[PDB]
Paper text:
Here, we report the atomic structures of an engineered diffocin, a contractile syringe-like molecular machine that kills the Gram-positive bacterium Clostridioides difficile. Specific attachment of baseplate tail fibers to receptors on the surface of a target bacterial cell triggers conformational changes of the neighboring baseplate, which leads to reorientation of sheath proteins and contraction of the entire sheath assembly. Since the sheath and the tube are anchored together at the opposite end by the collar, collapsing the sheath pushes the tube through the baseplate, driving it to puncture the cell wall and underlying cytoplasmic membrane.
There is a symmetry mismatch among the three major parts of the diffocin: the collar (C6 symmetry), the trunk (C6+helical symmetry), and the baseplate (C6 + C3 symmetry). The N-terminal domain of the collar subunit binds to the tube, while its C-terminal β-strand extends towards the C-terminal β-hairpin of last sheath, forming a three-β-strand handshake interaction. These interfaces are maintained during contraction, enabling the collar to function as a force transducer between sheath contraction and tube ejection. We define these conformations as conformers A, B, C, and D. As the trunk assembles from the baseplate to the collar, conformer A forms the first layer, followed by alternating contributions from conformers B and C, and finally, conformer D terminates the sheath by interacting with the collar. The density of the TMP ends at the collar region and it displays higher flexibility.
Numbering used by the authors:
A (entry chain k), B (entry chain a), C (entry chain l), D (entry chain P), E (entry chain B): 3 to 142
F (entry chain D): 3 to 354
G (entry chain C): 296 to 354
H (entry chain C): 178 to 236
I (entry chain f): 2 to 59
Write the structure that this text describes.
Amino acid sequence: NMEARNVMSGTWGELWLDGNKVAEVKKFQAKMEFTKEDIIIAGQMGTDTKYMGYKGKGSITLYHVSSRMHKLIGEKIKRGSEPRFVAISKLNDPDSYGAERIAVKNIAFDDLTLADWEVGVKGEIEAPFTFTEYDFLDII
Amino acid sequence: NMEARNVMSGTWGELWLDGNKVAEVKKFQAKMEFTKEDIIIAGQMGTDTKYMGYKGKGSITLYHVSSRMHKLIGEKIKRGSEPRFVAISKLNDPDSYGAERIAVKNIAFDDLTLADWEVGVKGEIEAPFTFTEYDFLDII
Amino acid sequence: NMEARNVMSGTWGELWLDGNKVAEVKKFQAKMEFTKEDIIIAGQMGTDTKYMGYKGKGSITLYHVSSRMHKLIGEKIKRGSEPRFVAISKLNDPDSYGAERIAVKNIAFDDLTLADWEVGVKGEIEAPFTFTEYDFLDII
Amino acid sequence: NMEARNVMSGTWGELWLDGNKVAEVKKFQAKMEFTKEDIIIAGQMGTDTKYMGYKGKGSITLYHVSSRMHKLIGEKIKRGSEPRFVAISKLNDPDSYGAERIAVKNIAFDDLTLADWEVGVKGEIEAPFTFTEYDFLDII
Amino acid sequence: NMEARNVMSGTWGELWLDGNKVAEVKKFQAKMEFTKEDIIIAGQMGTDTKYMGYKGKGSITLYHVSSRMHKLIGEKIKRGSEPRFVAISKLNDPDSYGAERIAVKNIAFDDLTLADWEVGVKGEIEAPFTFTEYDFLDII
Amino acid sequence: IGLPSINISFKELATTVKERSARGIIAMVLKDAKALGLNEIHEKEDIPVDLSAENKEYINLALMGNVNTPNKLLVYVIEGEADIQTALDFLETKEFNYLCMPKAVEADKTAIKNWIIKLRDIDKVKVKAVLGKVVGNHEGIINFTTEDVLVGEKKYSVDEFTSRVAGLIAGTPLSQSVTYTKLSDVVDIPKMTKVDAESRVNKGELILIKEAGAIRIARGVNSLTELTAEKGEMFQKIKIVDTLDIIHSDIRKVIIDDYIGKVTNSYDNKCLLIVAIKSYLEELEKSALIESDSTVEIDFEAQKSYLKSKGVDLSYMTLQEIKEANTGSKVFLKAKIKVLDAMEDIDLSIEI
Amino acid sequence: STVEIDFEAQKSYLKSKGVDLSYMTLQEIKEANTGSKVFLKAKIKVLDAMEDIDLSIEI
Amino acid sequence: QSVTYTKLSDVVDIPKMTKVDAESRVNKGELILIKEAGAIRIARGVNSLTELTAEKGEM
Amino acid sequence: AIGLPSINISFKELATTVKERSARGIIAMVLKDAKALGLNEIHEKEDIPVDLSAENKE
């Protein structure tokens, strides 16, 4: 049942940000980090852990073709009002079993890049973010 | 007695997680870290140590073919209920002396990966965990 | 709509510093770092964040052809009076959609290089700075 | 039968003040301090004690999102009329054996914070109090 | 003959309170403080002391998994009746010479913690007490 | 849906019922001319009115529990003039721990003894009975021989007090034992000497003894009297046999529910089964029913004997090859545990 | 599992057709003409499910 | 999977029938229903074959 | 001789250990007795011919 062709290729990924399709995505990332506390129990040599909560962290990397992030956050950040966004990522490799589609909610970005260029180097933008909620659509 | 053929190859490894066989496994790891305290004894130049307990730590890496970890932990983590699992690893090289089979118990994972893809890069997943107990079956 | 030709090349960048064009720019950079505070809310597993402010940081790298920075800041720094500058960057690739022109204001430099040379090595200068304000002119 | 999962996490707490739920509650505690008198008995080397009474003490901390305490006590305190309140605290961790609910009665606050703010720092309010009675609901 | 292995580790402790084992015990200690009077003898430069008695003090800390202390003392304390208890502490490290067991009698607790919880932090309870007598079982 | 109802009612105090027990299921057979069938009796209040008052008193005696009321009472009613085997056939279908039948005759007792011995030995089902006057050597048969128990100015025969004994046994928790358990309701017992008590307890009877204060049970022994190398003195105690039966029932339920026919017989699946059984044993260890340091393993000798029986050549075979060989549909396993006993005898020497 | 030409059935058919099988190589017999008949043999292995379990417990 | 110990919920009652008789009947080779803990379930998953030869064995 | 499914769980106690039997050595041995003539090949203590006397058994 397992074959090398069943591994998903990242070239078949798609991204929607704030309801708008971004054709220029290089990579997408989203992950939840658990908070754990060590608990030593009397009479037991192996120490145990208690689950307490989690952190969502991610990043988006995209080719520099337009001023998407400027228009999204630049003017509102200065005024003191922070916006929140929703992203949808889809991974659909024709040679795999099926598709994987996840919605990431309550996204707050970490920074804003105004200019970053070098002579003889093509432009790219990296945007880390945090999040709180998510949903599952079409899991395998 | 030793021949270079007697070294175990990692291609002959197998893994069961929560009673289910996983075929797209890349590496498995499990290790116990001891806690030690320095004790200086009067009249002795060499300082000694006292054993206090241990930490079990491990990780699993697998090719991205299905949503195994999502189905395992995603919905329960949000509600505040943490699950525990049992894993069995077997290493059986035909050119070695025998097999090695260990059960790792009370496994709690460290994080959950929702999406991680890149254009022109094949997908992979890394899942660290901790544990407390283990058993021996068929040691060499 | 996207063609690989639409990615902006950094060779098509231009920089004005204190109203004077610098022909010798290697790279220009400007970025805003947000300050965030973790907030744990009762009854919620996913911890949230509160936006508090931002840091602007950047840098300029240029070929060593003249004493621009010496004349700009050297004599005033010793006397105890710190100057502030305005920079304008333009990125205009003929194969892209349009131009991107940003003015960075209230620039304070981090250091001053008096001499840095090596035998068999051509000269270059790196100048980090901080800033507070910015404006948008001709965004895409 | 002690397990690490059974330890109660404080993120599952809830508070009711004067019949109204407070969502922004950060911390809650209540304690009874016993009053004891030393007694020395002839022919007995070890000193004994006599129990005479108790005094209840507690504290509340909230995120600064509204003027709740002002509306609660401010105008009344000026005129010379002191109000008493009832507070209900609930701690219900899904991984624990059960819920714990206690009602704290005859609460008198110690002070009133009109304003406490700091540039670059988020707002918090701490309110100590004293009480006299309590009741048990859903004991474990 | 002193060895590092012979030092007693506190993970091997055990506690019995009022005849019932407490699995969630974290800390136990008990101590007798002697009362001394300074005496100055004529013709003697160094001051001497006279022993007059002692006072016993101790403390217990447990992981918050149940309402044990509430059921122990809460209702009785309100009505004006003070209960006394007996505690047995056992310390038996496999690498040590032997076990050590002590019974602490006529225990009177100092306070009662109704509630102490914190978002993002696990629950713990600290309970000081005073005692009068003790007995030796399995001394080393 | 009617008008809103806000009713505040005043009443006097009412008596508190004893707490129900999660453990302990007892089945009783009653003979009444009316209302035949199986009835599940949870509480003392819910009893069908068709039964006679005497059957009601037997039920009520069975209801009372030593520390807690038994979890559930299964009553099968037969009119009479019928073979007992027809009620035993229906009782084979249900699940129960103890079997008692107050209205008994010698042939009926022999039938019950044979039926339970056959079940335990061949049917591989662990059940027990409390019988009046039976000399059966098995651990599944409890022999209680006390004559003329008087409760509340009444006379109860030896055969019809077994319901009370069964209720007492079912009410006892696992950590404790029935030795020296006192019965407050019982008033008077016929006179009897101590040497006779020693002789009877050595013989294997569960009798009543009169001590300082109320009446109490002397010892909690079984009817087993003949010992072998395999069956020692441990098996004569009710508590140990009870915990062993609980372990047997739990493991059998797990195996039947999850493994018979469901999974293929391969060495990996055997390892999975071993891990599951080890986890169950650890769970038992945490509850302090059994001592720590219990193990589960593949039974190598039985597997090798089975391979020899089928004509497989064991020459030039590695130990791993023998251990991992195909065994058709059979699985051979072995385990090891340890159980403690209660406190019953104390010697205290005082120097003056 | 193995798949191969059924040698015994092919030889039986060759005898039934009057062909002589003596002084013939194994390879010669394997690729001989057999009209409209094809004879093949395959060898596979199957396992049973768990039906009986023995557990020995020592106290 | 197999059909051994497969429970039939619809079936309610079977005639009284002894265990040793069931052993003998399945030894001859028969599919029968047995009474067991819980519902009514299939005793064994054998078929009618009872001749044992070198060509066809126990499997 | 197939039969009904068998699920037995047995309780027991006090097993014992034995001596390991090795495949190392071969010994040639001569005995005199008036019955069971010819060579005799023995691997274990249980497959001994009952024909030989106790003195020959020693």
